[PDB]
Design a protein around this ligand. Structure first.
Ligand SMILES: [Cu+2]
Length: 128
């Protein structure tokens, strides 16, 4: 619970938190994403996708283009630090990543890459 967070994406196209802080002393960090609400993945899909603020736009744009079967993520996208898969209602998914992939003083953003969603479905992550 020191090195992990629980996040929900619902049918209102929103995350239930908008800022995550990763403690420097964590060796690894975990995000658990769940999808309450009742809409299917093809219509209201949420992933939890992490990049630098600088790369967010590019990741969203290219993810948009890659289609549903690719979880709206460009395959092998180098800008994606960590991601869950794309989930629909009733589903849940985890991602654990090495905290050493982060550095102090850089601004990270987490976002959903289902088309259109990142407008509302974004938040900050920073390494303290
Ligand atoms: Cu979404």
């Amino acid at each position: 619970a020191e090195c992990s967070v629980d996040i929900q994406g619902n049918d209102q196209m929103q995350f239930n938190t908008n800022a995550i802080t990763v403690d420097k002393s964590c060796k690894q960090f975990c995000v658990n994403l769940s999808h309450p609400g009742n809409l299917p993945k093809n219509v209201m899909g949420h992933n939890w996708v992490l990049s630098t603020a600088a790369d967010m736009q590019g990741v969203v744009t290219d993810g948009m283009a890659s289609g549903l079967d690719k979880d709206y993520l460009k395959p092998d996208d180098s800008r994606v630090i960590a991601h869950t898969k794309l989930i629909g209602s009733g589903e849940k998914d985890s991602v654990t990543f090495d905290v050493s992939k982060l550095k102090e003083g850089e601004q990270y953003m987490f976002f959903c890459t289902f088309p259109g969603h990142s407008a509302l479905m974004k938040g900050t992550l920073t390494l303290k």
